């Protein structure tokens, strides 16, 4: 299969990797594995090391920085052995385990957390390759979101819901609205919005990814039942600076920052999405329910 490689500025050190996406499986994390090419004569410091930087850039305050002694030797992996076999007698492997309770590769739409593998002999003696620590969507759907509100001398009994909780990026969430206005105030307008909050563990905001302001007026003392559809994606969120975008490798275009799954005081950023049904009345009622937007698991 594919094998990524990158040479050092002086052309001697060649860092070899298999993948640049490490799926942060809820319980554990996929280790960073690679092998670095080295010519002993060129090596002047006599000590070549490999490091894993989990950096929060904006400022730069790391959270897990580790070092592995590439040479001289202080096990090996299935891909590393083949990489060495291809390279020969001048390459040395390195492995990193990423402990739990560590952030997930996530960036703010122009920031955020990042994962990098840097091999150096200890400027010209440093070679850096980006990676991603990211999380798939949960395997099985969660409970159906539901939220009912009452406003009162008569109620404005409202209810909103979504079919399920696990929704992939660029997929339409169905918002079921059920109103019963026994009050004498006509329902001027209905709003169904979806907002993304990106706490920075402390700062946070509320970016509306989706908006749908319908004029489905329900006259006083009358019921109503409808199924709206709102699709959150990046088609229209280009101007919104600060939106939590998912993990990148480069300036490539990515999707909405997958909802930060958790098993609270985890540094980096914690991102979540909520669907809000707000009735504007002739003095406006609100109800909400959260959902977790992520990417699927290829298979």
């Amino acid at each position: 299969t594919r094998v990524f490689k990158k040479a050092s500025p002086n052309g001697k050190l060649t860092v070899y990797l298999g993948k640049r996406d490490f799926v942060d499986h809820i319980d554990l994390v996929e280790p960073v594995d690679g092998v670095v090419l080295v010519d002993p004569e060129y090596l002047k410091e006599r000590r070549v090391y490999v490091t894993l930087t989990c950096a929060f850039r904006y400022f730069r305050k790391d959270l897990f920085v580790a070092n592995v002694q590439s040479f001289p030797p202080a096990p090996l992996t299935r891909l590393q052995e083949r990489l060495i076999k291809k390279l020969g007698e001048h390459a040395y492997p390195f492995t990193f385990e990423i402990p739990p309770n560590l952030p997930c590769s996530v960036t703010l739409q122009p920031c955020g957390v990042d994962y990098e593998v840097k091999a150096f002999c200890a400027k010209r003696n440093s070679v850096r390759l980006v990676i991603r620590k990211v999380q798939y969507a949960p395997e099985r759907p969660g409970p159906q979101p539901t939220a009912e509100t009452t406003r009162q001398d008569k109620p404005l009994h409202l209810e909103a819901s979504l079919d399920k909780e696990i929704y992939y990026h660029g997929e339409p969430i169905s918002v079921n609205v059920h109103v019963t206005n026994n009050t004498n105030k006509t329902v001027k307008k209905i709003k169904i919005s979806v907002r993304q909050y990106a706490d920075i563990c402390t700062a946070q905001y509320k970016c509306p990814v989706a908006m749908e302001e319908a004029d489905d007026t329900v006259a006083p003392s009358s019921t109503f039942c409808k199924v709206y559809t709102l699709t959150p994606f990046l088609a229209n969120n280009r101007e919104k600076r600060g939106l939590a975008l998912d993990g990148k490798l480069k300036h490539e275009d990515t999707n909405l920052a997958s909802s930060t799954l958790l098993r609270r005081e985890i540094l980096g950023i914690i991102v979540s999405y909520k669907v809000k049904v707000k009735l504007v009345v002739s003095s406006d009622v609100a109800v909400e329910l959260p959902f977790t937007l992520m990417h699927p698991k290829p298979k």
Partner: antibody
Amino acid sequence: EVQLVESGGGLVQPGGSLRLSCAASGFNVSSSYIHWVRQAPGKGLEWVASISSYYGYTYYADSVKGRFTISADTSKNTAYLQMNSLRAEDTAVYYCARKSMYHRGWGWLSWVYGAMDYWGQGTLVTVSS
Amino acid sequence: DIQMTQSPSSLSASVGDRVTITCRASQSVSSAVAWYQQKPGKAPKLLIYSASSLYSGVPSRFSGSRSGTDFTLTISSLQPEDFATYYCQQSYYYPITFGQGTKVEIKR
């Protein structure tokens, strides 16, 4: 399964207007690049245009630059190639295909534009007075 | 744009012939190449992608190879049913472009 269905195939006078609709099933128009391809009468293929709703990105062939317009209604989960200013150059059989964004291992490969694995049916668009 | 110049424009063969069709990109391409087999009228199929990847469901005998910018598709034992027009398409530079096709006729 994934399948695209084209509609809007019928006689239109030169310079007329048609709205080809590619209804996509088995995938969102946002988790894919929807491509419109046209083949002239008994002739080599030609790719018309492509769009991804998620990034709102549109790309057009040199033959439909400005004349046509591909957009999509993700509410209906459909793409719409509005063909305007049709001419004898636009006569063809029009197929619809897609290039998903899966198989990166994790998520969207927003730059492959690769092989258009799944193809539609083929609607005959005529241009003649 | 990129002109995926494909040759031969028409070749003759029969059952079992190891048929070869070459296609060269006008500019440099990075394995973005795919081979589509359009029969008379019907919708083009997909044969190869990534310039060397046998697409799912495509017959094994079909195979693509890259030698720089000269992408070759070989059918080891072309069968009576595999006589159609084969196009090469690069997905690197938009607008996407095809070759001109290479109809494989029958021999007698």
